[PDB]
Amino acid sequence: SSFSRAPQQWATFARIWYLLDGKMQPPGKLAAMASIRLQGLHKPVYHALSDCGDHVVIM
Amino acid sequence: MTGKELFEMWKIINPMGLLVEELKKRNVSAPESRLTRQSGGTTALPLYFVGLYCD
Amino acid sequence: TYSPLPDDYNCNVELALTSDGRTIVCYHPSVDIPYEHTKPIPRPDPVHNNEETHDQVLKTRLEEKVEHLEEGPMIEQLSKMFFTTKHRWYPHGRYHRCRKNLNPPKDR
Amino acid sequence: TARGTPSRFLASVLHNGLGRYVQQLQRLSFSVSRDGASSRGAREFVEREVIDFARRNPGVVIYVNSRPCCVPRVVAEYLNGAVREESIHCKSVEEISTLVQKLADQSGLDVIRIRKPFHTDNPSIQGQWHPFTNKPTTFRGLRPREVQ
Amino acid sequence: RGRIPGRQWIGKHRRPRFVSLRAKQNMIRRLEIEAENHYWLSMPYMTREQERGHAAVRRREAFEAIKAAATSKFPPHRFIADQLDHLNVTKKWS
Amino acid sequence: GYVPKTSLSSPPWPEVVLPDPVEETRHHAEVVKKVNEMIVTGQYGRLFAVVHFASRQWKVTSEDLILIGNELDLACGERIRLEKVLLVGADNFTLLGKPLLGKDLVRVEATVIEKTESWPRIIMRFRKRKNFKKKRIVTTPQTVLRINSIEIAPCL
Amino acid sequence: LRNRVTDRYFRIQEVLKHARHFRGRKNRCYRLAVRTVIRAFVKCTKARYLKKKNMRTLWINRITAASQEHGLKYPALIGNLVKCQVELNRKVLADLAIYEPKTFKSLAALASRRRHEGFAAALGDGKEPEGIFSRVVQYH
Numbered sequence: 001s002s003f004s005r006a007p008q009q010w011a012t013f014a015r016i017w018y019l020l021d022g023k024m025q026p027p028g029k030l031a032a033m034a035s036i037r038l039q040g041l042h043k044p045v046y047h048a049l050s051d052c053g054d055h056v057v058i059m
Numbered sequence: 060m061t062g063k064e065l066f067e068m069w070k071i072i073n074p075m076g077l078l079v080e081e082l083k084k085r086n087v088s089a090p091e092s093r094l095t096r097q098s099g100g101t102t103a104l105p106l107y108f109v110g111l112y113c114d
Numbered sequence: 115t116y117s118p119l120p121d122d123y124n125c126n127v128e129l130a131l132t133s134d135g136r137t138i139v140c141y142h143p144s145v146d147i148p149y150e151h152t153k154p155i156p157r158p159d160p161v162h163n164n165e166e167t168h169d170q171v172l173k174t175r176l177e178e179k180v181e182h183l184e185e186g187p188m189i190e191q192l193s194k195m196f197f198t199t200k201h202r203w204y205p206h207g208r209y210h211r212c213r214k215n216l217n218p219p220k221d222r
Numbered sequence: 223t224a225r226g227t228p229s230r231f232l233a234s235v236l237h238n239g240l241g242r243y244v245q246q247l248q249r250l251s252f253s254v255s256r257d258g259a260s261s262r263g264a265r266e267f268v269e270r271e272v273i274d275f276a277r278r279n280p281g282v283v284i285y286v287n288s289r290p291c292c293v294p295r296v297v298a299e300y301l302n303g304a305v306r307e308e309s310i311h312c313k314s315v316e317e318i319s320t321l322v323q324k325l326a327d328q329s330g331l332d333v334i335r336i337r338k339p340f341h342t343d344n345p346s347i348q349g350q351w352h353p354f355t356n357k358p359t360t361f362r363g364l365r366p367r368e369v370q
Numbered sequence: 371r372g373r374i375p376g377r378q379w380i381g382k383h384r385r386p387r388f389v390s391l392r393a394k395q396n397m398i399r400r401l402e403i404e405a406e407n408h409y410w411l412s413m414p415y416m417t418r419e420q421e422r423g424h425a426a427v428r429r430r431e432a433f434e435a436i437k438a439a440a441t442s443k444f445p446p447h448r449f450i451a452d453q454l455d456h457l458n459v460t461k462k463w464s
Numbered sequence: 465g466y467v468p469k470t471s472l473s474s475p476p477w478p479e480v481v482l483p484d485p486v487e488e489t490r491h492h493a494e495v496v497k498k499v500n501e502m503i504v505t506g507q508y509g510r511l512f513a514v515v516h517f518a519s520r521q522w523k524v525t526s527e528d529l530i531l532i533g534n535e536l537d538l539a540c541g542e543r544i545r546l547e548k549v550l551l552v553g554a555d556n557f558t559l560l561g562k563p564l565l566g567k568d569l570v571r572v573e574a575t576v577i578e579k580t581e582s583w584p585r586i587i588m589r590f591r592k593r594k595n596f597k598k599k600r601i602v603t604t605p606q607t608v609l610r611i612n613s614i615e616i617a618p619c620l
Numbered sequence: 621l622r623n624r625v626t627d628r629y630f631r632i633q634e635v636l637k638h639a640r641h642f643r644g645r646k647n648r649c650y651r652l653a654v655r656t657v658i659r660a661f662v663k664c665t666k667a668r669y670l671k672k673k674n675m676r677t678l679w680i681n682r683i684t685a686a687s688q689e690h691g692l693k694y695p696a697l698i699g700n701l702v703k704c705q706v707e708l709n710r711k712v713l714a715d716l717a718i719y720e721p722k723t724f725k726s727l728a729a730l731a732s733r734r735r736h737e738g739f740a741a742a743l744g745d746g747k748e749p750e751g752i753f754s755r756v757v758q759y760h
């Protein structure tokens with residue numbers, strides 16, 4: 001690490017873009033993964049005040 | 060000195076030049092920067108990761 | 115052979131139990147990103163300010179980017195820039211403005 | 223309530239236990255009455271216990287003013303500048319001894335909501351979490367749906 | 371649209387409830403604990419004629435202690451020293 | 465006992481084959497010799513520890529603070545060996561206890577700084593239409609510890 | 621008027637100083653500030669149990685996130701970690717998940733290996749070895 005403070009916090013709280021295919025999937029099983037990664041629940045730095053959301057791109 | 064990073068006390072200006080001078084002393088050739096991880100180049104809040112490779 | 119987790123990301127664990135039996139030992143050196151998993155840095159060198167007559171006309175051209183919008187289109191532009199909605203970029207009253215900490219505590 | 227009072231983070235004043243421990247109390251200013259029943263416990267405290275208290279922890283300077291007052295007080299001054307004034311009006315000898323001992327123990331920071339009772343100054347060692355921890359790299363760093 | 375006539379949990383027409391798997395498994399484990407209690411109560415040790423007076427002395431001593439604590443109830447003592455050291459209220463510097 | 469391949473013939477999870485226990489015991493001996501040599505030659509730095517103390521568990525490093533909510537009958541300035549260290553860890557190796565590590569491996573030292581009360585915490589009850597209104601103000605005692613050193617020994 | 625009350629303003633201030641930060645006429649008038657300060661103190665007293673519950677639910681969410689990064693579910697991690705006799709509570713597990721991810725990968729590898737040992741013990745009833753990262757340490 002050792003990661004000077006503002007680069008470190010930028011690295012921790014950054015946004016990530018995700019791609020998820022459709023093509024013979026049920027919409028609910030796509031919606032579950034999209035809901036988890038839109039809320040940011042897949043991160044251990046999660047908190048509902050922290051706005052730790054990610055982008056989800058479904059094709 | 061507890062809880063403070065190094066360059067919060069030294070406050071250098073050009074770290075890459077000091078780094079290539081330091082590697083000039085240690086007989087390691089020259090660090091080339093290669094792009095390692097990135098997440099969103101087109102937006103207004105990117106994130107990059109540059110790693111410095113020596114040989 | 116058998117490893118309980120994939121050993122390509124973050125770390126490489128070996129789990130060991132002591133001969134006494136009373137303490138579990140985990141050895142985990144970090145794994146680097148090797149050289150062939152990196153693309154080189156793009157080098158943007160865009161230069162189209164040179165016209166042959168003057169030389170400091172390009173320095174004149176350097177400040178040619180200014181725009182004025184009213185509150186509506188500016189809010190729509192910020193909303194499509196940062197992927198939020200419109201309700202952030204409106205102001206607040208005096209009451210909500212003047213009861214906010216300007217000297218907040220600081221851990222670390 | 224905690225929204226109605228200020229709050230601070232848990233902190234040492236000048237990194238006490240790291241090097242040498244220093245007594246964070248500077249002064250105790252006593253104001254007791256010669257005549258007057260309200261200062262009877264403090265009168266007996268000045269009789270018997272303030273001499274042993276002054277010998278016990280010598281970093282503190284103790285003053286006894288002996289002033290006509292309807293309410294006796296003790297003013298405790300700390301190293302960081304704070305001033306804590308407490309009234310010893312109609313108390314026992316044991317209560318005043320407990321009060322000056324508790325003033326001798328604590329440090330001069332505010333007694334407000336103390337907000338996350340731990341102060342790691344380098345909390346991570348193996349490296350703090352970022353979303354590219356626990357993620358594998360791919361050959362030449364290609365993104366999904368790439369061509370070359 | 372799905373309306374039950376008033377106060378769904380009492381009366382003639384009620385909102386129906388159904389038994390989950392949670393409820394059956396909970397009731398089953400409680401029934402197993404109760405069957406084990408039925409077992410361990412089934413073999414006594416002293417057969418009701420050998421216990422006839424085996425604890426009479428301890429019970430009589432316990433009730434005699436209760437009775438002795440009950441009948442020994444009386445005002446507390448009163449002393450000269452308390453009445454005289456109330457005069458310490460107006461102690462000045464001596 | 466043969467079933468041809470269908471969707472439900474075999475279990476969906478991949479078949480795991482745990483190793484032979486003799487070679488695994490020799491491998492455990494090799495790894496603990498590696499980690500013991502790393503300790504004895506001094507290849508660590510800024511190790512942390514998880515410590516059980518005053519009914520809580522404190523993820524603790526050197527030079528920090530912990531504040532516990534009870535007196536300790538200890539004058540300030542006195543040093544303390546916090547026992548019950550149930551995880552120690554440097555970079556590149558950790559050691560787990562079962563549940564507690566040995567007393568000879570890890571040794572956590574701690575100094576007491578400050579013995580204070582708390583800010584006044586309000587306790588109030590209320591029941592409507594019953595004329596019920598109680599109120600208390602409670603300041604519990606507190607103690608501040610400062611974790612000086614987390615040493616480690618090669619007895620393993 | 622024999623002995624009518626003089627220090628009424630200090631009682632009004634004693635109630636109003638906990639209501640300076642309210643909204644509306646509750647920060648000024650005593651008849652309204654009393655009811656809102658009473659409800660505020662009852663909420664402050666009842667909030668401690670909700671604080672402890674919400675903090676443990678937050679720890680459960682963070683541990684579920686980190687373990688699902690490692691391909692493990694939360695019940696598998698907690699159960700098979702307690703079956704190796706390591707008694708780490710949810711607070712230090714979430715703090716290890718955020719700040720020490722190598723130690724969390726070591727713990728997830730331990731929980732997955734004890735899970736696999738339990739599965740092979742279920743197929744074999746033991747016979748021989750009852751695993752390795754089983755065999756609890758016995759205290760007397």
Ligand SMILES: [Mg+2]
Pocket residue numbers: 374375376377378
């Ligand atoms: Mg109805």
